[PDB]
Every structure is written in structure tokens, then in C-alpha cells.
Amino acid sequence: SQIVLPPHLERIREKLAENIHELWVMNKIELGWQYGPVRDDNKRQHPCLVEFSKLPEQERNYNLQMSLETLKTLLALGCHVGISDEHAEDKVKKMKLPKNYQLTSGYKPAPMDLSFIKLTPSQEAMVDKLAENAHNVWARDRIR
């Protein structure tokens, strides 16, 4: 609770939300998970294959907020944000991913910059602690 969202971090909050929405849309459309624009709870139709606006905006705000406590947990563990420059902020490359691994709309698949960045073992340990805390939060929500 004590963590307050900074403007620098909320600038990329919505980009992270769009990226994770990309994760759900492509993962569903690739694993063959059922497509439905309508919220039909009976035959298991999932609206996670829809454009941002026509996506259930309650779910989209859920994703935006989930990003928020992701940022807040990451800052609270002991990782401090540092902005390099607006040039590296602009630096991003769009992969060429076809319609099969693309969502139904024409939003070009562009998750992430696979070119030069590598994964640190310390970053992996941090993300492990992040998943630990997220699972703990979800379990406490279920207990409530």
C-alpha cells in the first residue's frame, strides 16, 4: 500500500497491459482456445480474443491494475527503477508474426525486443520471488 505509482512507471503501465493482453490473445488463438465475443458462461466461450475497447473493460482494467501491483511489488522488493533515456524508450522492434499467431484484430504482434537483451540469473530469482508474492496475494484473496 505504501508504494505510490510514479509517472515514469505509469507511462509504460498501459504498454505492459497491452503486452500482457497480447500474451492472452495470442496464447488462446494459438492453443485453439475458444473464440467468443459474447459472455457465454455455459459452453465456455472466452472474450480474451477481442479488441481492447470491445474487450470487457472490467477485465481490461483488471489487467491494468494487475500491472500496477506488479510495478509496486517490483519496486517494494528492493529493485529501483532507472530511466536511461527517451531514445531507449523509443527503442522497440516489432516481430513479424502471422495471423495464426496473431489475435483476431489487426493489432500487429509486437511483444518484446528479442534481439540483444539477455536474462540475468538474479533477475530470474527476483521474478521467482515476484511469482511467490503474487501466488500469496491470490491465496489470501481466496481465503478472504
- Which residues contact residue 37 at a Cβ distance below 8 angstroms, ignoring those fewer than 6 apart? 47, 50, 54
Give the resolution to one decimal, in Å.
2.7
- Identity at 44, one-letter amino acid code: R
> What is the Cα–Cα distance from 92 to 110, expressed in whole angstroms?
9
- Which residues contact residue 134 at a Cβ distance below 8 angstroms, ignoring those fewer than 6 apart? 70, 73
Query: Can you say how many angstroms the Cα of residue 79 is from the centroid of all Cα atoms in its chain?
Result: 19
Question: CA-CA distances (angstroms) from residue 51 to 43, 59, 96, 98, 106?
Answer: 22, 12, 19, 17, 9
Experimental method, per PDB record: cryo-EM
